[PDB]
Amino acid sequence: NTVYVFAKKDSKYAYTGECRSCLENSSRPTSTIWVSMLARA
Amino acid sequence: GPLLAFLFRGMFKNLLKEVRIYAQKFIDRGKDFNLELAIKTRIISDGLK
Amino acid sequence: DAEFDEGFKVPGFLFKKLFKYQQTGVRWLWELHCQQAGGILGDEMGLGKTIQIIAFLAGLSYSKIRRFEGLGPTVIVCPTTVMHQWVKEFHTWWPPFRVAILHETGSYTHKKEKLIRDVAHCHGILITSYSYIRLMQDDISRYDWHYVILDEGHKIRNPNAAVTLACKQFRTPHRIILSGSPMQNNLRELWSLFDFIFPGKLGTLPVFMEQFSVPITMGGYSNASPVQVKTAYKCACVLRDTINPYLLRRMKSDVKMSLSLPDKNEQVLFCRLTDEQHKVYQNFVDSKEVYRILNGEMQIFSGLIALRKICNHPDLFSGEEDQFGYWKRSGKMIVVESLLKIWHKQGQRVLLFSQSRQMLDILEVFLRAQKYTYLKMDGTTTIASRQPLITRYNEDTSIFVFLLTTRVGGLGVNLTGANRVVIYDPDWNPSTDTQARERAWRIGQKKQVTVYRLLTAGTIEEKIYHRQIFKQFLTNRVLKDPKQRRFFKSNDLYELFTLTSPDPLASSSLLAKMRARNHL
Amino acid sequence: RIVEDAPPIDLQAPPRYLLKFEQIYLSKPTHWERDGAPSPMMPNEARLRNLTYSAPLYVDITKTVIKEGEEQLQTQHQKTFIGKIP
RNA sequence: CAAAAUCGAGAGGA
DNA sequence: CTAGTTGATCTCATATCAGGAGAAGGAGCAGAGCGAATAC
DNA sequence: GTATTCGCTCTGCTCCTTCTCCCATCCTCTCGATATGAGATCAACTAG
Numbered sequence: 001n002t003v004y005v006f007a008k009k010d011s012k013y014a015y016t017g018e019c020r021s022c023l024e025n026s027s028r029p030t031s032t033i034w035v036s037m038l039a040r041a
Numbered sequence: 042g043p044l045l046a047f048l049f050r051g052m053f054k055n056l057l058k059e060v061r062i063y064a065q066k067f068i069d070r071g072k073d074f075n076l077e078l079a080i081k082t083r084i085i086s087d088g089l090k
Numbered sequence: 091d092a093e094f095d096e097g098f099k100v101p102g103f104l105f106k107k108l109f110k111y112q113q114t115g116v117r118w119l120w121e122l123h124c125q126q127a128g129g130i131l132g133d134e135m136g137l138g139k140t141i142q143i144i145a146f147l148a149g150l151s152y153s154k155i156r157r158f159e160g161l162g163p164t165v166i167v168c169p170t171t172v173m174h175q176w177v178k179e180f181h182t183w184w185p186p187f188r189v190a191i192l193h194e195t196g197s198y199t200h201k202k203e204k205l206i207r208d209v210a211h212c213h214g215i216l217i218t219s220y221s222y223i224r225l226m227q228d229d230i231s232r233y234d235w236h237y238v239i240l241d242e243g244h245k246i247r248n249p250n251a252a253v254t255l256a257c258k259q260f261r262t263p264h265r266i267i268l269s270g271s272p273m274q275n276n277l278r279e280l281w282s283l284f285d286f287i288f289p290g291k292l293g294t295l296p297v298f299m300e301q302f303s304v305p306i307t308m309g310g311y312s313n314a315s316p317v318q319v320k321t322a323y324k325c326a327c328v329l330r331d332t333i334n335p336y337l338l339r340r341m342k343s344d345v346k347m348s349l350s351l352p353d354k355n356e357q358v359l360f361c362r363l364t365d366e367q368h369k370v371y372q373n374f375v376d377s378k379e380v381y382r383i384l385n386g387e388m389q390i391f392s393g394l395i396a397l398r399k400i401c402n403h404p405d406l407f408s409g410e411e412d413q414f415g416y417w418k419r420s421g422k423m424i425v426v427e428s429l430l431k432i433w434h435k436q437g438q439r440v441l442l443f444s445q446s447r448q449m450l451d452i453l454e455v456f457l458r459a460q461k462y463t464y465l466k467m468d469g470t471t472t473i474a475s476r477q478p479l480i481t482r483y484n485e486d487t488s489i490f491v492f493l494l495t496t497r498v499g500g501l502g503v504n505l506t507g508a509n510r511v512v513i514y515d516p517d518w519n520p521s522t523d524t525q526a527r528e529r530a531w532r533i534g535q536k537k538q539v540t541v542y543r544l545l546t547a548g549t550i551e552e553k554i555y556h557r558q559i560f561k562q563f564l565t566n567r568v569l570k571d572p573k574q575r576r577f578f579k580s581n582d583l584y585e586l587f588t589l590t591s592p593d594p595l596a597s598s599s600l601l602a603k604m605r606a607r608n609h610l
Numbered sequence: 611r612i613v614e615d616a617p618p619i620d621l622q623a624p625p626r627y628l629l630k631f632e633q634i635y636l637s638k639p640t641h642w643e644r645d646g647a648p649s650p651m652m653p654n655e656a657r658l659r660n661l662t663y664s665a666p667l668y669v670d671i672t673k674t675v676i677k678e679g680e681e682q683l684q685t686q687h688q689k690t691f692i693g694k695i696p
Numbered sequence: 697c698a699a700a701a702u703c704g705a706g707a708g709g710a
Numbered sequence: 711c712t713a714g715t716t717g718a719t720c721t722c723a724t725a726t727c728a729g730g731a732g733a734a735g736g737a738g739c740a741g742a743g744c745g746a747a748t749a750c
Numbered sequence: 751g752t753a754t755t756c757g758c759t760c761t762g763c764t765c766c767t768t769c770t771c772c773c774a775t776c777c778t779c780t781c782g783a784t785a786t787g788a789g790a791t792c793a794a795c796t797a798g
């Protein structure tokens with residue numbers, strides 16, 4: 001449930017900020033979502 | 042706590058699906074069905090064990 | 091001489107001996123030959139079919155009808171038990187035919203392959219057993235045969251048996267099957283049969299299951315829903331329509347008056363376990379092995395076989411006058427002793443059947459304990475001696491009782507000489523019981539016969555009886571009518587291990603019929 | 611939380627059945643002999659006998675049949691054994 | 697006269 | 711020579727994410743050069 | 751009749767995607783999981 005911006009040096013994305021979301025009650029597994037920024041109109 | 046609840050959640054889901062199967066076959070045959078035969082208790086017992 | 095549609099002439103004297111139903115059957119069979127399709131003779135056991143086939147073949151050869159001029163090299167697959175009967179009937183009715191046996195007994199005394207070749211080049215009627223076909227399938231299936239008559243072909247009900255695949259190799263379209271019971275366990279037997287005679291008619295096997303086996307079978311259960319019952323009824327009507335032309339099934343109910351048979355009785359006896367036998371049964375059903383089986387751990391064969399043995403007799407634990415298999419230790423044997431006494435005092439000839447060879451041996455020992463004149467036959471007896479023994483027993487009335495294993499005792503043998511029949515031990519396949527009890531009430535039976543089927547009440551035998559009752563219900567649901575009442579005496583589950591001892595159409599008819607089909 | 615989160619399974623041919631679960635219980639750990647007599651089992655006996663030190667979980671189910679015409683009846687089978695928890 | 701299985705997991709030692 | 715018995719064998723039948731690196735194959739583009747082919 | 755193109759071919763360059771192999775040695779221990787018989791043939795008897 002917290003947003004983490006990482007970057008993989010050998011990669012096609014300049015960045016990627018994931019959020020391994022999960023409803024606090026153990027209702028379903030965590031559903032991750034990424035919000036990236038394509039590498040280097 | 043969290044690990045064992047991960048197991049219980051999965052195994053309870055499987056109990057519920059199996060009870061659906063059992064209830065469904067006997068209801069399809071037009072007959073009622075007993076819970077105590079629907080609930081294959083060994084699922085949770087042997088899964089956790 | 092009887093004249094058929096196109097050119098089929100049978101000699102008049104030969105036609106005369108035939109009854110009405112048999113000549114009707116001959117006409118039907120030649121019509122089948124005209125279409126170039128196979129067929130099944132559904133006439134019940136003993137209505138007389140070898141006569142029908144012999145008459146048709148003799149007429150065809152006599153008619154010189156048009157590869158083959160008239161009759162080509164045929165083959166008759168028959169069980170070993172009736173082979174010399176077949177030869178005798180061919181010689182009696184049509185002695186012109188050359189009938190040569192392919193058997194170890196045989197009449198050749200040389201290489202068999204030479205015999206098959208000679209019969210093929212001689213337009214002879216080669217008779218053989220299923221075993222040679224299974225073994226010699228290479229050699230048999232190369233000679234451009236004409237007919238492949240299967241006597242008691244119901245052996246082929248196993249679709250994937252080696253014999254089945256072996257006999258399904260002959261390329262001729264004229265395939266004949268002789269069996270009064272061409273379905274014994276379930277619809278798959280019917281499927282394999284119509285696979286052999288007419289490969290296309292019913293669809294491929296899985297299609298056949300989905301299309302008829304499920305809607306038909308599942309609709310007969312006690313718990314069947316009314317809509318499902320109507321569905322099964324519809325499908326059964328459709329299937330009977332489909333297969334109608336290729337089964338000719340006359341009962342011994344519409345021909346009895348035109349055939350002058352004596353009366354028959356179907357009394358079923360519900361035996362009581364003896365104290366020792368009851369104790370053994372109670373002990374075994376309380377054992378751990380049955381508990382393991384009910385838990386699915388072990389194969390169900392062993393427990394069922396043990397229960398059958400117990401009910402037949404406490405031979406598991408061989409307990410003077412206490413020798414192995416002593417008659418007073420099994421209630422069925424006491425009742426049998428009583429009936430044998432009564433019938434011997436009544437001067438009647440009895441027929442004694444059993445499923446298992448060992449109980450047949452115990453019964454033989456008990457008969458030796460009595461003074462009754464017996465005469466026994468099982469798979470052990472040499473085949474060459476079997477038909478002579480049948481002739482003997484049908485000849486002299488001195489022999490009081492006749493011992494048989496049902497797997498050879500039934501199956502096309504004529505035992506009109508006997509008067510009384512007792513079925514000691516039931517089986518899973520009711521067709522076995524029907525064939526056994528029909529060994530007596532046949533053409534030529536000059537005395538009233540009565541059937542006595544023995545079941546130990548409240549035991550495994552009662553449950554097997556229920557199962558085979560359900561089986562006759564399934565079969566009659568399609569062979570006799572589609573309005574069969576649902577089986578209700580048992581739910582047929584795996585609680586038979588328990589002991590419960592007592593005490594041109596004008597486009598309007600077509601539309602209307604089709605609507606009727608759709609409103610079920 | 612898991613039990614009351616699990617959705618009720620409405621199955622029907624017609625008669626329909628949801629099989630609702632609402633409450634749990636845990637009895638103290640117990641052992642049943644071959645005869646089946648429930649007795650209290652201490653950890654030392656479990657270790658010496660190679661058993662499992664566990665407690666039986668009970669849920670009080672509530673099944674309602676709804677076929678037609680408001681033919682509703684709440685069937686509740688109190689203390690329905692589900693499993694054993696270590 | 698030689699009697700005593702295999703496959704996975706884990707913890708260790710130098 | 712020649713019928714009867716004994717064993718072995720075989721068939722059928724019974725219910726119910728925090729690898730990587732290097733080779734191989736095909737892909738798409740790019741231009742060179744030569745057959746004919748228009749055309750001055 | 752030779753420029754002149756030109757289309758077609760024929761390499762052949764990059765460039766990407768696919769696929770396939772490899773990961774120190776030796777040693778000790780524990781623990782959990784992973785039928786039954788009827789019948790027919792045939793061959794050797796087993797005697798006549």
Ligand SMILES: Nc1ncnc2c1ncn2[C@@H]1O[C@H](COP(=O)(O)OP(=O)(O)O)[C@@H](O)[C@H]1O
Nearest residue numbers: 107108109134135136137138139140141504533
């Ligand atoms: N018209 C007939 N004339 C003489 N014998 C007949 C006649 N019809 C039937 N039989 C005899 O009835 C007996 C049973 O017939 P068969 O075909 O051998 O058994 P199944 O009817 O079960 O097929 C046979 O012995 C047959 O010779």
